[PDB]
Amino acid sequence: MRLTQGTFSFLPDLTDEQIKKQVDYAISQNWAINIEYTEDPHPRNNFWELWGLPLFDINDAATVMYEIGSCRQQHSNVYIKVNAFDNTRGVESCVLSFLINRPSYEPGFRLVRSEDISRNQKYSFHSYATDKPEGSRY
């Protein structure tokens, strides 16, 4: 399956040129940019791993593209995403998040159901990738 988290995941995997244009957009809005990665694709895995610190007050897209390449050398077998953050009062949140790397094969999720009171059930999303330990998932 295709993991459709991220702003552009119904479009094909973005080229480096497409990614650079999104980085240029973020820079033009004075947003901070960071890079994160994970091998737990759970929809509520809120804290993907940090690739260094966020880049604040960025003038040059090439600095971001360099770190994207550097992160890919270590983690191109798993998920990598680019986030943009706006610290304007009343936002103070992520304002853009898109996937830049995916595993070659994502097996996706088992929907787990348990019987509960009357007709109610409890549900869990089990990642098939997480059947194996970190480092052996993808």
Partner: protein, 480 residues
Amino acid sequence: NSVEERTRIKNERYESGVIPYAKMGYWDPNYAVKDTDILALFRVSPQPGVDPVEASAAVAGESSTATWTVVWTDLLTACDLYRAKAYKVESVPNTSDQYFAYISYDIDLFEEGSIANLTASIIGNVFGFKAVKALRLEDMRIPVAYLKTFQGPATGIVVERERMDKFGRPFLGATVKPKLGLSGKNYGRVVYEGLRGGLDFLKDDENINSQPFMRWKERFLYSIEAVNRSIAATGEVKGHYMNVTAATMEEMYERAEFAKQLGTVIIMIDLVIGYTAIQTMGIWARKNDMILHLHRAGNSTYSRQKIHGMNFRVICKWMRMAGVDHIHAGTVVGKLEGDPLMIRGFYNTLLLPYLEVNLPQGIFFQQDWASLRKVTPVASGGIHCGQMHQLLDYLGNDVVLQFGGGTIGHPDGIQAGATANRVALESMVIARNEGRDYVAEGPQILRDAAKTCGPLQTALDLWKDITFNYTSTDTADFVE
């Protein structure tokens, strides 16, 4: 002859009898507005022979402390303070006998945190006064000190995006159709197909509560199954607006608690439940980590006609204060009324932390929102993916675009309809972000994406020339 006759008030102002409202203290063109005052702007149409200042002073009086004849009991109170003041009366541009009346009300007139009390004064009786043949409330300045007595949105758009893990684009949704008649299991089918095909949300129709053709509990149960199926299928957080609208507060609570127990991220309510049930739900939603969608059912009964009623921007203010997380706010290009500049005013009222006066958008008061959370506007009704460029331009990035007929009417099925909308959205967002003139190029941007998306090709072929071009009823009085 008696002690009552002997102690009668001889003072001209407080002797018995009728005197004009404009001579009772309710007209003061030199009044210095305080930053704690509640201000209201009324569009006033006096009857023939009624003076514009007197009509304005009557509205001020009968929405604050006055009645029709003088009362001595005024003197038991700090009446100079409690009287509302019409302080500016202006001719409306391009009209013969229509006026803008600006009225100031002291903060102490109002119950803290109560939309019912605010509205009891501002709209309680004055719209039925014989002496004005029409009256419309256009805007209000809610001071920071009064705003701080209200919760504001339970969730707000910032926390909503965090719960959904969805940033940098509009949300997508769809109302399930037909409006009435579907069973619980069929409802769940539609929800599963729509979410699994690409929509972030679906929703109950406003009139889907609990009925002979479908009782509410099975709908909620099948709906959460559909939601969780779609989450497992996609890896996205998804939601369905379970409608908890009901006859009594106890029934609404029973439905909201059940939805909570099932683990829905989101519920909905209808404006027809009324302000007190809405405030009660706003508080419940904050307490229970729930996104609270407000459908504006019945709003157009008073909001449509320019000369009389309440402009929707005022309702936006009251519902933001009350604690809803979404409100329907127009599409411009769909089947329901929506002048683009009026809509811009509505969306800004819901989303901005601060508004400057902007007469072309119908924003008459500077409005500080006191850091109350932001309401997500909802664009819904008669829209389709062929308009995506227009929707992104008129309505912006912070909105739920809801495509009911525009998803479920797709000839290749509900999943195809959802996929068309999702691809159309992302294609338009990426083009906007790249700096492209996406309004001029929009039709071509959609055609290009359609080259590798059959569902979108089909949707464009079916609906691309569907338009809803009619003259607006609700329009500005000023232009840029």
